[PDB]
Design a protein around this ligand. Structure first.
Ligand SMILES: O=c1ccn([C@@H]2O[C@H](COP(=O)(O)OP(=O)(O)O[C@H]3O[C@H](CO)[C@@H](O)[C@H](O)[C@H]3O)[C@@H](O)[C@H]2O)c(=O)[nH]1
Ligand SMILES: O=c1ccn([C@@H]2O[C@H](COP(=O)(O)OP(=O)(O)O[C@H]3O[C@H](CO)[C@@H](O)[C@H](O)[C@H]3O)[C@@H](O)[C@H]2O)c(=O)[nH]1
Ligand SMILES: [Mg+2]
Lengths: 271, 269
C-alpha cells in the first residue's frame, strides 16, 4: 500500500461565496494571506504525496496560475533583491512534487469530479482533499489517514463527531469500533435529516480511497453513494483524526477561521 | 458631469503573497466581495457609467470578474437559483460598461492615471484606489463629485492622520472654504513627519479635471496635481465615512471584522 497521488476537486460553482467566486474557485479564497487550496496541498505534500491532481472547472485560471511558475513575478522579485518573497512564490511546491490539471466537463458533482481523475490515478490508491475543510493539526490529517489505510489495508475516511443538528451538512457513517480512533464503516449516507441520521460521526473532506471506487462512481453522481457501494465489496474505515477543522464552505465558517487562525498564527485581534 | 472612473488594479500586494500570486491585490475579498467590487459599487452609486480598469499581472482575473459569464448564468438559471443569478448580473449593472487598458510597467499611480487618458478624453473623471475601502452612508465618490460640480474644480478626498504616518500619504496645504472643503495650494508626496506641512492626507479618492493629463506627460500623481495647481482650482474635501486601509494584513482584517458584523451578522466567536 503506497499512497502518492492526491486529487483536489476545485471545479465547483462556489455559490455560497458569490460574488467573490464569480471567476475564482472557492478554494482560491485566502485565509489571511494563503489560499485554502495551498493549505491542503501543503498538508498532502507533508503526508508523502508527490503527484498532485487538480480537477478544474470554468474557473481553472486562478488554480493553474497559483501552482504553476510565474517567471515574470520571479524576475521582478529577484531583481529587487526580495529573495525572502521569491521563495513564497517559487517554492510553493518542492522540487520532488509535480502537478497536473484535468478539466471536469461540467459541474456534475463531487463524485463525478473524483471519477474525472481516474485517467491520472490508474489502479493506485489515492487521496482526495476538499480544501474548504481547513484543518489545523500538529500531524497532517492526511498522514494520519494514510497510516491507517496502510495498516488496515483499506479505504479510510476522516471523521469527527458533530452536533446532531449539523448532520444535514455532511456525510454520516454507521460503523463498528476497531480501535480507539478507528471504526469499520457499515454505511454512509449524505446529508441526512438530523431525525434520521444513524449517528453523529461525520465525514471531513479528507479521504484515502482504493481505486476500486471508480467502477462504483460509474454505476452511481455523489461521492458518498460511490463509497456506500464500495462498502459492500471492500473494507472502508473511518478514522477520528486529531486536529481542529474549520468548515470554510460557508461565509460564517470562513469568517471564524480568519478570526481564529488570524489570532493564533498572525496576532490579528478584533478591535 | 463626472461619469467615468479609473481603477488602478495592478497591485502586486507583496504583503499578501502567496494569495496574490495569481490575482491582483484588488481582487482579494473582504468577506464575500473583492476589494475592487466595493469601489466599483461606490462609483456606480455615484452615477459613474464608464469603468476604466488599468491592469497589470493576472489581468484576466479582473476581466473575468466583471465580464458576463454566460456559462455561469445558464447553469444558475437552470437550477432555479434566481436570487444568485441576479446577484451575478449585478456585478456589472446593465447601464454600466467597462474597458481594460494595460499599464506598460509599474511606474506609479501617476503613470496609471495617464494610461487612462485615451479612454477619458477631455472630461472630468474619478480615480478610486480599491485598497482604501470606505464604508459611508452616502458614497464618498458622490460626496466628492458634488463638490467638484459645485466649485468647478478637481477634488481630493482627505482625512486627518497622525503626524507619524505622513510618510504613507500625499499631504495637502490648504485654506478652509467651508466646514468640510478646503482650497488646496500645495501638495507633497509622503513627507517625513518632521517636514509635513499639515496632517491632512489624501486617501484613494479623486475627482480630476482632464487638464491633469498634460501635467502628467511628471510620473507621480502628486507632482501632476501640484502642476495642475498652477493653472486650475483643486479642493480637498473631508468626506464622511469610515476608511479601512486594506494595504496591510492588519487593516484588511479589521475590515473583515467590521463589515462582517455590519452587513453579514458575523461576530467573532
Ligand atoms: O461539480 C463539482 C462539484 C463540486 N466540486 C468540488 O467538490 C467539493 C465540494 O463538494 P460539495 O458536494 O459541495 O461538498 P459538501 O456539501 O461540503 O459535502 C462533501 O464534503 C463534506 C466534508 O466537508 C462531506 O461530509 C460530504 O460527505 C461530502 O459530500 C469542492 O472541492 C468543490 O470544488 C467539483 O470539483 N465539481
Ligand atoms: O506602479 C504602480 C503603482 C500602483 N498602482 C496602483 O495604484 C494604487 C496604489 O498606488 P501607490 O502609489 O502604491 O499608493 P499609496 O502608497 O497608498 O499612495 C497613494 O495613495 C494614497 C492614499 O491611500 C495617497 O495619499 C498618495 O498620495 C498616493 O500616492 C493601487 O490601486 C495599485 O494597484 C499601479 O497601478 N501601478
Ligand atoms: Mg464544503
Amino acid at each position: 500500500h503506497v499512497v502518492r497521488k492526491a486529487v483536489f476537486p476545485v471545479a465547483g460553482m462556489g455559490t455560497r461565496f458569490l460574488p467573490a467566486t464569480k471567476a475564482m474557485p472557492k478554494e482560491m479564497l485566502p485565509v489571511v494571506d494563503k489560499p485554502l487550496i495551498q493549505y491542503a496541498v501543503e498538508e498532502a505534500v507533508a503526508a508523502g504525496i508527490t503527484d498532485l491532481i487538480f480537477v478544474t472547472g470554468r474557473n481553472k485560471r486562478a488554480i493553474e496560475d497559483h501552482f504553476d511558475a510565474a517567471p515574470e513575478l520571479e524576475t521582478d522579485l529577484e531583481a529587487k533583491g526580495k529573495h525572502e518573497l521569491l521563495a513564497l512564490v517559487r517554492d510553493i511546491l518542492p522540487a520532488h512534487v509535480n502537478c497536473l490539471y484535468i478539466r471536469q466537463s461540467a459541474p456534475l458533482g463531487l463524485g463525478h469530479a473524483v471519477l474525472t481523475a481516474a485517467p491520472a490515478v490508474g489502479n493506485e490508491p489515492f487521496a482526495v482533499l476538499l480544501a474548504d475543510d481547513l484543518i489545523d493539526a500538529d500531524t497532517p490529517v492526511l498522514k494520519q489517514l494514510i497510516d491507517v489505510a496502510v495498516a488496515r489495508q483499506g479505504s479510510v475516511l476522516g471523521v469527527q463527531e458533530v452536533p446532531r443538528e449539523d448532520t444535514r451538512k455532511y456525510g454520516i457513517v454507521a460503523s463498528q469500533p476497531v480501535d480507539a480512533r478507528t471504526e469499520r464503516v457499515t454505511h454512509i449516507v449524505e446529508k441526512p435529516a438530523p431525525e434520521q441520521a444513524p449517528t453523529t460521526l461525520a465525514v471531513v473532506g479528507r479521504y484515502v480511497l482504493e481505486a476500486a471506487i471508480f467502477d462504483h462512481l460509474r454505476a452511481t453522481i455523489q461521492l458518498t453513494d460511490g463509497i456506500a457501494a464500495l462498502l459492500r465489496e471492500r473494507d472502508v474505515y473511518a478514522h477520528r483524526y486529531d486536529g481542529k477543522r474549520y468548515d470554510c464552505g460557508s461565509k460564517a465558517g470562513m469568517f471564524q477561521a480568519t478570526v481564529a487562525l488570524g489570532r493564533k498564527y498572525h496576532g490579528l485581534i478584533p478591535e
